[PDB]
Amino acid sequence: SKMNLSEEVDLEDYVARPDKISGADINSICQESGMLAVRENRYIVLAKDFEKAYKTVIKKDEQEHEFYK
Amino acid sequence: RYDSRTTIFSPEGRLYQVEYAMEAIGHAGTCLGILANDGVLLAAERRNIHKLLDEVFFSEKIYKLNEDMACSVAGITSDANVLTNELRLIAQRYLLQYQEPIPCEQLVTALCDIKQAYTQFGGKRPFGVSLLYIGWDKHYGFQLYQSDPSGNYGGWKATCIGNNSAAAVSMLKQDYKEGEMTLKSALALAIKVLNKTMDVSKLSAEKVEIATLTRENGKTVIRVLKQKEVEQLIKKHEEEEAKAEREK
Amino acid sequence: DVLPPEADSSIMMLTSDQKPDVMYADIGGMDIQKQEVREAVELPLTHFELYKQIGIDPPRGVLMYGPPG
Amino acid sequence: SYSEIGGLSEQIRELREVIELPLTNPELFQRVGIIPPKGCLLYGPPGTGKTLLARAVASQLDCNFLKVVSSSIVDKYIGESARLIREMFNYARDHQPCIIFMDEIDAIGGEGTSADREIQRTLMELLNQMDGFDTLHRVKMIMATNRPDTLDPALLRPGRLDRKIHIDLPNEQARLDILKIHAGPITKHGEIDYEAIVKLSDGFNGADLRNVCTEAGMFAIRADHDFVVQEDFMKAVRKVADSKK
Amino acid sequence: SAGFDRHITIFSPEGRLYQVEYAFKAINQGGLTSVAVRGKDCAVIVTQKKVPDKLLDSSTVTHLFKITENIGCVMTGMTADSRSQVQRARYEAANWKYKYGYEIPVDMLCKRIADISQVYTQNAEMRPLGCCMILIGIDEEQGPQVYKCDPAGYYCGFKATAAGVKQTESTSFLEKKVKKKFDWTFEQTVETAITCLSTVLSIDFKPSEIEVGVVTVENPKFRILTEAEIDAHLVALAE
Amino acid sequence: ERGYSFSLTTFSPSGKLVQIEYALAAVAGGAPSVGIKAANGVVLATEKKQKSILYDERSVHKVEPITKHIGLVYSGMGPDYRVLVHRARKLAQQYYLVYQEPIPTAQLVQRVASVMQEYTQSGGVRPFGVSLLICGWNEGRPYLFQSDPSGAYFAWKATAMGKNYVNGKTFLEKRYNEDLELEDAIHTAILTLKESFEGQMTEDNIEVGICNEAGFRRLTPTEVKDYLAAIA
Numbered sequence A: 001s002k003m004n005l006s007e008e009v010d011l012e013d014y015v016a017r018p019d020k021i022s023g024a025d026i027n028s029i030c031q032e033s034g035m036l037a038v039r040e041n042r043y044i045v046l047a048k049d050f051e052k053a054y055k056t057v058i059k060k061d062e063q064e065h066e067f068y069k
Numbered sequence B: 001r002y003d004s005r006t007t008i009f010s011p012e013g014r015l016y017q018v019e020y021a022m023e024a025i026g027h028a029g030t031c032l033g034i035l036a037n038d039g040v041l042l043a044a045e046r047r048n049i050h051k052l053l054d055e056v057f058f059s060e061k062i063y064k065l066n067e068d069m070a071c072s073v074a075g076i077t078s079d080a081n082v083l084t085n086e087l088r089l090i091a092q093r094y095l096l097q098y099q100e101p102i103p104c105e106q107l108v109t110a111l112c113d114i115k116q117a118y119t120q121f122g123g124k125r126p127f128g129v130s131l132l133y134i135g136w137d138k139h140y141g142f143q144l145y146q147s148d149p150s151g152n153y154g155g156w157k158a159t160c161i162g163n164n165s166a167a168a169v170s171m172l173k174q175d176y177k178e179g180e181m182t183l184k185s186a187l188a189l190a191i192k193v194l195n196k197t198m199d200v201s202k203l204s205a206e207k208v209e210i211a212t213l214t215r216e217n218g219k220t221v222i223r224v225l226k227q228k229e230v231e232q233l234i235k236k237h238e239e240e241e242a243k244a245e246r247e248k
Numbered sequence C: 001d002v003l004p005p006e007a008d009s010s011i012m013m014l015t016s017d018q019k020p021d022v023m024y025a026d027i028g029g030m031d032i033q034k035q036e037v038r039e040a041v042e043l044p045l046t047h048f049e050l051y052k053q054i055g056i057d058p059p060r061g062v063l064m065y066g067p068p069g
Numbered sequence D: 001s002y003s004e005i006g007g008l009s010e011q012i013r014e015l016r017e018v019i020e021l022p023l024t025n026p027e028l029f030q031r032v033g034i035i036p037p038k039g040c041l042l043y044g045p046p047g048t049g050k051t052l053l054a055r056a057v058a059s060q061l062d063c064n065f066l067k068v069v070s071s072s073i074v075d076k077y078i079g080e081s082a083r084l085i086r087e088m089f090n091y092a093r094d095h096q097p098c099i100i101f102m103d104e105i106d107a108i109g110g111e112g113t114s115a116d117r118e119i120q121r122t123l124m125e126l127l128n129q130m131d132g133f134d135t136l137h138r139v140k141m142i143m144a145t146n147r148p149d150t151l152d153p154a155l156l157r158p159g160r161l162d163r164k165i166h167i168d169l170p171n172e173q174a175r176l177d178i179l180k181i182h183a184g185p186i187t188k189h190g191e192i193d194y195e196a197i198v199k200l201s202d203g204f205n206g207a208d209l210r211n212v213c214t215e216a217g218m219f220a221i222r223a224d225h226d227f228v229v230q231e232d233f234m235k236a237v238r239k240v241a242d243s244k245k
Numbered sequence E: 001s002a003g004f005d006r007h008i009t010i011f012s013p014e015g016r017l018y019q020v021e022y023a024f025k026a027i028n029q030g031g032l033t034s035v036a037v038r039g040k041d042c043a044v045i046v047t048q049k050k051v052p053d054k055l056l057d058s059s060t061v062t063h064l065f066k067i068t069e070n071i072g073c074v075m076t077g078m079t080a081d082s083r084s085q086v087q088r089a090r091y092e093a094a095n096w097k098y099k100y101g102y103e104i105p106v107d108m109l110c111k112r113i114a115d116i117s118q119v120y121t122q123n124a125e126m127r128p129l130g131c132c133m134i135l136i137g138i139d140e141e142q143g144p145q146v147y148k149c150d151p152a153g154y155y156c157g158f159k160a161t162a163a164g165v166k167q168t169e170s171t172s173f174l175e176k177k178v179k180k181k182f183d184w185t186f187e188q189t190v191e192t193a194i195t196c197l198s199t200v201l202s203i204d205f206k207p208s209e210i211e212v213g214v215v216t217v218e219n220p221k222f223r224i225l226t227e228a229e230i231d232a233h234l235v236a237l238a239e
Numbered sequence F: 001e002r003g004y005s006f007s008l009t010t011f012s013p014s015g016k017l018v019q020i021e022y023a024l025a026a027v028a029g030g031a032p033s034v035g036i037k038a039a040n041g042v043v044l045a046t047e048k049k050q051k052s053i054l055y056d057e058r059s060v061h062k063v064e065p066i067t068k069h070i071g072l073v074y075s076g077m078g079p080d081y082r083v084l085v086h087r088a089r090k091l092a093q094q095y096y097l098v099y100q101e102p103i104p105t106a107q108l109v110q111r112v113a114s115v116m117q118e119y120t121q122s123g124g125v126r127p128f129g130v131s132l133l134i135c136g137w138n139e140g141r142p143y144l145f146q147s148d149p150s151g152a153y154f155a156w157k158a159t160a161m162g163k164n165y166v167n168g169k170t171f172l173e174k175r176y177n178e179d180l181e182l183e184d185a186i187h188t189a190i191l192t193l194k195e196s197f198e199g200q201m202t203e204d205n206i207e208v209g210i211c212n213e214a215g216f217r218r219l220t221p222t223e224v225k226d227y228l229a230a231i232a
């Protein structure tokens, strides 16, 4: 509500995903998307930045070791 | 401290690992054998009575060893499984070698001999499972035998193990009946004690398992009671309980 | 002369300039959790008469628990 | 300056974007509507120059700088490990803005004993100090580690020390720049075969090059006084190779 | 997060075998990384050949080993354990061929190898071998296949894979490549592997700095391209 | 309990074998897999979600057969699962060689659990940190058994191990009716993994094995895709 979001940014396509992201994760998804929009000197957060940031906060596994599964 | 290995003797002479295995039976299930002539029974309890548990065995706590021997179990599941496998193997070995059924005590002696060996040789955890035995023989007839994870055993007329073992044995002693212990009275006493030693009241039939051994025409039929007869037994106990409230 | 006691910030009691600045509407969802917390730590202070009208002492402690974030 | 540390241009730029921006021009962050990011995590081989990077940022921003050995703060006595973080943060509250550069966190960041639950308690105290109650504040942290997998996942969050910057051993082209900045001050009229030194210094870390320069100066001290020959750089590299092992 | 660890047989309270975990962090001790990518009709493996001296016999510095005429492997990890794994795999493949009458599929090969490594994880007798096996070979009716199988004993089929210090970066770049689907011809596969190693290392790759092994369906034989061939491939990559 | 959690042959003062519990916790931190027993047959489902697109999804199968009428699924250490499946196949083949009849599910699960117990009785060998769900079609009644590293084999009608297993069991006892059939057993099994699987249900991410009158068989990706389009 305080973030400057482009009209093409439809929040529903991210809230309907089955990933069990927490409220802290949600705030992370928002803040890092805004950060990515800032990096490109853009003053409006686009859906591309939201999708890019959405992939970096839900891939928490990353390291793992592939043999605990 | 002196409980690192099962072969370590404490300065007071106490095998701490053994007693740790002994006291762990409090986490085991409730199985009891009541006094009874011309018969004998065990009354087990099903902790895991979750609805998603399909029932296939109907004897998860009741095992038959010989054609005239049955035993319950109270301890670690894997230990109980291997112990009952060894039980059946030893009973069948005796049957093959002597062409005669094992006479109750010598089978229990065999298990206790195997069990104590784990408490003496290093590198093996003591068998943390105690188990009742029932059976009949041409020597002493119906007997009730108490296994104990230390390899110690003992003849018994009425005993219980597992959760609330002390309460169960005290209640069995409260109404302890010698001689006049007909099978109906034994079943009634088993239901009556299970009503209190089990925290859950009303003694649901599906959560209570009774196995009986009787001498019928020299066959020693080992019976596990189905849901209908357990239901009528708990019904009999309930009707008897209603009369007991007339005092007030 | 007796001087008024000095216990303004002995153990970091929140001063007028240390308000967290977090509105109830700022936090998202948590409607049941907000109501239960508001019903033990905020409502009793204001509407104590409504608590006393039924005969119950207001609950004194709450424990918020759950996954991190 | 940022030119003093050589070959980290990308990593330098990310660290500037993370820390310099909220402290110099917060108007961008408030115009976008996001709380300014706080905290950057530099991970890499030891001696690669993360501390030098932190000092460069604290020098350009002209702000007070706190450097702490995180392994030192975990003391045997209970509660002092978290107490040190507490005093550090309340100290940063008074003197603002602050660069809270913490050393190898693997001691603090990343179970059935009191001493192990002490590390848990100091970890919770740390995460509470960075993100949480009282004042969200404007100070920044340059908390750097040696082993990034050990670090707690909660310790990696946007308002909670995000942006894992990788600072690997000096890059292949970075060795030349490092030798230029750390050997140029040293008087040397003779030509340099820098590629030969770089190939003879494989697996070297940033501090090793500075020791090479200082020790070449020492060789000159034990001699005429003027740096004239490449054989000096060769033997300096070898002794900074075998004697620094 | 040290944990119980010290004995490989001891589970941590959370349920992770810390000692087996450190085998993976022992894998990247060698400072080298090997990249495998599966093409439409071939599989190629590229490794790091960093000879840190002028006195080393460059012929024997190879990280590529030929287990069987149809299957080859590349090593990333401690050199001694990697050679021991090579020797064990050669014996396993020979035993399979002698016992069942036909050459071992690449999948069964370090299915067996990972089975050996798994027993080492359970029984506290052998210290686990800290090295990964990346296997390539043309098996009929499934074409080329690539298998990366770790000290912990987990094997899986990879359209492309890489193990080493630069393992995460390489697998990320492959993530970028295999997705924009294209004709994965042999030259394209070699180009993809070369680009992988070059991008993750940012090295111009002098022809003496790498060793590439090729297995193709047309000639199902493990071949290590000589210096001139990899020079030509690097030139074709340049333009 | 604190210093005795290391050894698996040392009883705690409360007599708790803590190492077995830690192996079970390792089981609870695996990939969620669900099996439910229908009046028509048994269906087992698991998520083989690779860490990258780079993996060959058809390379390694989790839902695997032992005999023509028995299949396995697991939630835990895959390398440990492979040795388990090898020993289970060997035991089934040994029974077939001696009795000439296919192994009944109860007996096979009993001997597999006995194999599990063999690794939890001496120091130096680790318990098999995987829990196994086993189906069977024999003597005209379906079976579904779960065997844990402790060696305790159950008779689950419908269960789910792995991550978010509590929520998986919570889903059951709600949409699981005893008088169901195999066709809706597939839909229930796919639904159960849906509450835990973080992502879209793509045909190479959920592997299902039906264990019907004809026998156990791992579903090909096309049929899984058909069911997955039906449910979605």
Ligand SMILES: Nc1ncnc2c1ncn2[C@@H]1O[C@H](COP(=O)(O)OP(=O)(O)O)[C@@H](O)[C@H]1O
Pocket (backbone or CB within 6 Å): D004, D005, D006, D007, D008, D045, D046, D047, D048, D049, D050, D051, D052, D053, D170, D178, D181, D182, D205, D206, D207, D208, D210
């Ligand atoms: N990349 C680099 N460029 C220039 N100098 C460096 C570099 N890395 C290290 N140094 C030198 O090494 C010294 C100490 O390095 P330090 O900051 O302690 O490394 P780290 O932070 O990795 O421990 C510094 O005084 C600096 O002059």
